[PDB]
């Protein structure tokens, strides 16, 4: 209902969160947040 | 393929460009401009045409050689380090772009050719834009990101500023969103001086004033002609950082200090946030309004849209600051106002309701409670602050004052001996008012002195003392019954007179 | 052959011929209008330029 | 729309010149817009907030502020 634009959107975007934060791992090691992201 | 070796950062400091390092690819560019001189005279020898290919096709490899090899890789590892890092040295960066190409542009007066000293120069000047374009003006990662790591340094060495003033001398509800969410719609610290906050103490405006104006040079001097739309962007990014977290957290860090509004009994931390709103008022009102009225007169290049920068964004930041301070004036005139009101009234009933109509004309709790408020509360800071707002502190909080003698001095509720002792404790305090720090009280609580010696009518003294002067601050049929204000009227028949 | 400066902040503006005629003014930028047709004319009379 | 928004734009520059009208012949050419309070370098924008640092000691900075 809403969670497909918040958190079941997270629940189909759930890798893509380390993997969006890839994202300046390129442009301008990786433990902390891909590991034990809460 | 450097591996950006220390020190980045040392360079993130509210100043100008800073430490380590060169470039290190200036010297590649001095390698260049000499290895341009040399392939200048050996190709201007050696070739028929001249800006082919030495300008054509080796000012290409010169760019296509080290621009784009040696300068993405500087942009990889400056980048790499921090972002308003390789913002500022960005401007440096292609500022340094600038230098060797002005050095294209002397160098280019080395050669000769008219074609040439036209775009062909242009063309390496293009290929300088070129190198512009890989961190391109056209996207927001040259302005706009440059504004966004330009808000990373703002509200770090800005919001940070004044850092436990900012965070926090509050919750932060501080009268801003309780006073102005009502009114435009108390103890809080304790108890020195405008102490970084205000603001901070102008050097933190002079902070903000210093890496936000030096990047809004930076940004401003750097970037092409479409400057005074990212102007009125980071400047309202100011009006963020100083009318708004400067005005509303860095002063509402003085409104922290206004925290202490509705200070009925409680002029001891007012005692301290006189000279804390009152150096908001100095150091960011005057400092902040004049430095933000001359530099906005160079910022506003020739727009009209640029007034839309004088008036909504300046001057309604004066108007809606005005707003913001003066009806915090308002409030802690209120809390002055009600301090000396409300403590200066608050005399028991041997005082401030004394039947002593044959005795009791001495100092009390008139005196104690209206030098002690407001003697305690702007015989503290406020004689010694605001000349910033001089003749509206002095001459309008001793104006409240007088409206506080018309609540303590001329509504002191004592009987026709104890008007007396309103003339030697609010009389006492009329004077002492006029000490008090919030001192213009030497006419109206005057008034309230010769109402004083009015409102001591006894049977033998009640006709012409209350008849005098300043004694028609007493009633006009209530001057025989000025201690009509009190529980005892006048003493067998106080009405005797208007007939 | 005037390459005209910004006059507020110092840095230098666009280039501009400077045609000085009989009675008027045609300080004008010819870049990239390489004629010396229409070049860019910030114009006026001489009777009032200063 | 450049009647919807044209006449909306000339019938509003007419009014405002209704408005200033004011008795005098008021000949209305001035546009300064001053707020409550009346180079050529590289640093010497920095030496502008160093002026206003000068502006900072200038001049108690006094002014009226009360309500």
């Known amino acids: 209902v809403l969670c497909d634009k918040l958190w079941s959107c997270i629940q189909g975007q759930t890798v893509s969160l380390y993997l969006k934060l890839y994202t300046v791992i390129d442009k301008h090691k990786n433990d902390i947040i891909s590991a034990f992201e809460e | 393929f450097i591996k950006n070796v220390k020190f980045k950062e040392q360079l993130i400091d509210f100043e100008n460009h800073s430490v380590i390092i060169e470039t290190s690819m200036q010297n590649l560019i001095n390698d260049v401009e000499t290895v341009i001189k040399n392939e200048s005279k050996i190709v201007k020898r050696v070739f028929e045409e001249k800006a082919t290919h030495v300008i054509q096709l080796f000012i290409q490899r010169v760019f296509a050689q080290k621009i784009e090899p040696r300068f993405e890789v500087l942009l990889r590892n400056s980048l790499s380090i921090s972002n308003l890092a390789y913002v500022r040295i960005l401007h440096g960066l292609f500022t340094l772009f600038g230098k060797f190409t002005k050095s294209l542009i002397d160098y280019f007066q080395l050669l000769e050719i008219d074609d040439s000293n036209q775009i062909l120069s242009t063309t390496l000047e293009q290929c300088f834009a070129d190198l512009f374009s890989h961190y391109l003006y056209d996207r927001s990662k040259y302005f706009g990101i440059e504004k966004r790591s330009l808000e990373a340094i703002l509200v770090d060495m800005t919001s940070k500023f004044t850092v436990n003033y900012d965070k926090e001398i509050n919750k932060r509800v501080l009268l801003d969103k309780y006073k102005e969410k009502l009114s435009t719609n108390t103890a809080s610290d304790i108890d020195n001086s405008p102490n970084s906050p205000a603001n901070y103490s102008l050097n933190d405006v002079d902070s903000m004033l210093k890496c936000v104006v030096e990047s809004t040079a930076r940004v401003m001097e750097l970037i092409p002609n479409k400057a005074h739309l990212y102007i009125l962007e980071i400047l309202k990014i100011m009006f963020l950082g100083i009318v708004d977290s400067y005005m509303e957290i860095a002063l509402e860090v003085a409104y922290w200090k206004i925290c202490k509004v509705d200070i009925n009994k409680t002029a001891g931390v007012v005692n301290l946030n006189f000279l804390k709103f009152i150096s908001m008022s100095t150091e960011i009102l005057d400092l902040l309004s004049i430095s933000i009225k001359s530099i906005f007169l160079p910022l506003l290049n020739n727009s009209p849209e640029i007034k839309a920068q004088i008036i909504e964004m300046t001057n309604s930041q004066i108007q809606k600051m005005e707003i913001l301070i003066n009806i915090i004036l308002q409030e802690t005139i209120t809390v002055i106002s009600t301090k000396f009101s409300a403590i200066l009234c608050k005399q028991k009933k041997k005082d401030f309701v004394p039947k002593s109509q044959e005795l009791l004309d001495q100092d009390t709790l008139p005196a104690i409670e209206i030098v002690n408020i407001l003697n305690l509360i702007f015989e503290q800071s406020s004689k010694f602050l605001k000349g910033k707002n001089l003749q509206t502190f002095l001459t309008l909080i001793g104006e409240e004052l007088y409206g506080l003698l018309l609540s303590h001095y001329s509504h002191f509720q004592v009987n026709s001996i104890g008007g007396v002792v309103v003339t030697k404790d609010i009389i006492g305090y009329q004077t002492a008012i006029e000490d008090w720090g919030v001192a213009s009280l030497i006419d109206k609580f005057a008034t309230l002195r010769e109402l004083a010696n009015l409102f001591t009518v006894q049977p033998e003294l009640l006709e012409s003392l209350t008849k005098e002067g300043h004694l028609a601050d007493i009633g006009r049929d209530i001057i025989q019954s000025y201690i009509s204000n009190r529980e005892d009227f006048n003493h067998d028949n106080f009405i005797n007179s208007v007939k | ?50 | 729309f450049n009647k919807i928004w044209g006449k909306l734009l000339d019938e509003i520059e007419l009014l405002l010149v209704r408005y200033i009208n004011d008795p005098e012949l008021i000949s209305s050419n001035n546009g300064s817009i001053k707020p409550i309070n009346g180079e050529d370098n590289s640093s010497v924008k920095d030496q502008a907030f160093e002026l206003k640092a000068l502006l900072k000691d200038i001049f108690p900075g006094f002014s009226v502020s009360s309500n």
Do not use: H
């Open chain 3, 1 to 50: 052959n005037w390459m005209e400066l910004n006059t507020t902040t110092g840095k230098p503006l666009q280039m501009v011929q400077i045609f000085i005629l009989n009675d008027l003014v045609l300080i004008a930028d010819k870049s990239r209008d390489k004629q010396n047709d229409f070049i860019v004319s910030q114009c006026y009379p001489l009777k009032d330029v200063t």
